[PDB]
Structure 1
Amino acid sequence: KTAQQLKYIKDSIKTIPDYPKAGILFRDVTSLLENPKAYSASIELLSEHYSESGVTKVVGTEARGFLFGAPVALALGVGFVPVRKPGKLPRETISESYELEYGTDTLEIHTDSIQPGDKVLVVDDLLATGGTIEATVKLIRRLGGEVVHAAFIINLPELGGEARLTQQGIHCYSLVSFDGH
């Protein structure tokens, strides 16, 4: 059943060749979002895996992360805290930076939404280089949150996200894995 749900999940994700630019494969989770079965099972499986873990908040990073972290928060019956692109959160924020191809950008979190003692699970769609999750984890930790787990629908191991998270004291968990080739 679990093994079968995973294959059903993996086949609902479409692979787009030469996106964004040529010789690059893109895994489109939106084909999963429109398959009611695959989408519920993905949230069931992420929830169940963290039932025994004592999580008090889930953090998801804008925007595809919203689609997995928020339903996981709902299933665990805990609060959801969003990490956002700059200038969207209205209350007091802190900021972290992360690298893009051509520059740098920032993520923000509300300072009142995390505090000492919170046990935080990060949920996201995609572990690629891991730069956004690294920035997200530093946000959570600067506010005294404890983060040991990050959960992903898709893992791209050839980009070495996993070991970069391990270096930062995060154990990663993922549903499916895809090759870069």
Structure 2
Amino acid sequence: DSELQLVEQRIRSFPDFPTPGVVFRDISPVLKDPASFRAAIGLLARHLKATHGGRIDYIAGLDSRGFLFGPSLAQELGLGCVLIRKRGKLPGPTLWASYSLEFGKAELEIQKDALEPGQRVVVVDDLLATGGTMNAACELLGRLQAEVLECVSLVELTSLKGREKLAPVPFFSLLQYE
């Protein structure tokens, strides 16, 4: 698939960033090459329409690199985008959820009025690793009584088993690395 190739050739890997042991996958070149960015959005949108038909109400983009894909994906689908943020950034009543990151803990947050009960959402981030971030996003959406139809990313790190962590919520990635 030549479209998928346009995305894969624009991921660059950095060993031992930001700390020894981690291989950082940088999506920055995807954003800088408009053909690559369009390809990524199109592949995601095609997968989602093929899997869900007209059942998706909103895209939810995750702070911060998910913000890079969420609005464009939503627009391609004719949908709105809701935001899930790092704690402390959103005004009005919120809910929050932790999930260890690094050697400690961190929290995502959503506005209590971001969605109505029963609304169906697809969550997008750039990369799925342990699944902690996406899992916290699903927890928050679930607490608003929203139905998470699927989580998607450009990149999945399969040895970290984030897919199993999200089960039974379906997951889809464009590219997989160990």
Provide the C-alpha distance between the structure 1 equivalents of 2:46 and 2:162, rounded to a whole number of angstroms.
23
1:23-64: per-residue Cα shift (whole Å, max 9, x none)? 431110011110111111100111121121510011111000
List alignment gaps of at least 5 residues for structure 1.
Answer: none
Provide the C-alpha distance between the structure 2 equivalents of 1:104 and 1:17, rounded to a whole number of angstroms.
24
The number of residue pairs the alignment matches comes to 175
Provide the C-alpha distance between the structure 1 equivalents of 2:151 and 2:21, rounded to a whole number of angstroms.
29
Find runs of 4+ consecutive structure 1 residues off by over 6 angstroms. none
**1:30 counterpart letter in structure 2:** S
Instruction: Give the superposition deviation at 1:21.
Output: 1.9
Match of 1:155 in 2: 156
Match of 2:174 in 1: 175
Match of 1:40 in 2: 38
Provide the C-alpha distance between the structure 1 equivalents of 2:23 and 2:103, rounded to a whole number of angstroms.
20
Instruction: Give the superposition deviation at 1:165.
Output: 1.0
SS in 2 for 1:46: helix
Match of 2:128 in 1: 127
Match of 1:20 in 2: 18
Match of 2:111 in 1: 110
Instruction: Give the superposition deviation at 1:73.
Output: 1.0
List alignment gaps of at least 5 residues for structure 2.
Answer: none
Match of 1:59 in 2: 60
Provide the C-alpha distance between the structure 2 equivalents of 1:13 and 1:108, rounded to a whole number of angstroms.
28
**1:113 counterpart letter in structure 2:** A
Q: TM-score normalized by structure 1? A: 0.93
CA contact (8 A) 2:13 2:23 kept: yes
Give 1:5's match in structure 2, choosing from 3, 6, 9.
3
What's the C-alpha RMSD, in Å, of the aligned pairs?
1.1
Provide the C-alpha distance between the structure 2 equivalents of 1:131 and 1:159, rounded to a whole number of angstroms.
11
Provide the C-alpha distance between the structure 1 equivalents of 2:86 and 2:13, rounded to a whole number of angstroms.
26
Provide the C-alpha distance between the structure 2 equivalents of 1:67 and 1:6, rounded to a whole number of angstroms.
18
Instruction: Give the superposition deviation at 1:119.
Output: 0.5
Is 1:142 equivalent to 2:159 in the alignment?
Answer: no
